[PDB]
Design a protein around this nucleic acid. Structure first.
Length: 232
DNA sequence: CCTTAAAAAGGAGCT
DNA sequence: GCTCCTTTTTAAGGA
């Protein structure tokens, strides 16, 4: 009955916001929580501590940009096999077992420019470590369907190539496919008064089966919205 | 590429 | 390491 919660926190270099995120995570009580864009540099890795979530695996560059992290609840059990940390801090893959069941989580943050090509280059750069139990989530910085933009301007070529490279490895957009005809968005761009869903949850089709519920959470922490996923 | 808004990060000047 | 203000950063439409 585990729950996974993805969020683009947009910077964590102030201790006050760190305690705010602490309280928010305690209130949400996720089995696993995926943070993107911590803007934490590796020197500062040790500053991300949240009581009740002792196990934290981040990936940080040497500049206050990007920075991903995966937090595991003390209430749950997590036995990791192998962990791959991006040298630049844009993705981290944690592979192992959650409640005895196998699971490989890819927490990804793509740059805004050339986002779909970056996502697929990582996706096929790692596929030997990819498998049938995969869960790739995070800050895609790109739409996937035409409904992921309020403008509804139908989707770029690189993005549909990505939605089909998902296909050639049998990965599918858990949210788009447990929720098509969606008008829920994760990011609001003020300079344009537009809305988009650039944050995503994308898993193996094997695990369709297990996926029970998805949800989208407004918060006071970031200009992005969090995505919750119930697993049983 | 260039511009935007608005928040995150940085920096001056004192504590 | 502050307060208060300046600069950088980040998503995204328009040329």
């Amino acid at each position: 009955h585990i729950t996974i919660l993805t969020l683009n926190i947009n910077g964590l270099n102030s201790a006050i916001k760190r305690h705010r995120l602490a309280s928010w995570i305690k209130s949400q009580d996720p089995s696993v929580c995926c943070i993107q864009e911590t803007h934490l540099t590796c020197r500062d890795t040790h500053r991300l501590k949240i009581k009740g979530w002792r196990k934290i695996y981040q990936a940080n560059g040497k500049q206050k940009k990007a920075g991903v992290a995966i937090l595991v609840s003390d209430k749950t059990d997590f036995k990791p096999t192998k962990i791959k940390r991006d040298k630049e801090g844009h993705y981290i893959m944690v592979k192992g077992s959650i409640q005895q069941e196998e699971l490989t989580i890819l927490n990804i943050y793509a740059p805004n420019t050339g986002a779909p090509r970056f996502i697929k280059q990582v996706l096929s750069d790692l596929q030997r470590d990819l498998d049938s139990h995969t869960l790739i989530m995070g800050a895609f910085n790109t739409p996937l369907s035409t409904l992921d933009r309020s403008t509804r301007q139908k989707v770029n070529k690189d993005t549909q190539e990505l939605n089909s490279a998902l296909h050639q490895a049998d990965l599918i957009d858990i949210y788009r496919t447990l929720h098509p005809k969606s008008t829920e968005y994760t990011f609001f761009s003020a300079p344009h008064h537009t809305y988009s869903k650039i944050d995503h949850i994308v898993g193996s089709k094997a695990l369709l089966s297990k996926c029970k519920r998805t949800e989208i959470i407004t918060n006071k922490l970031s200009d992005h919205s969090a995505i919750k996923l119930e697993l049983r």
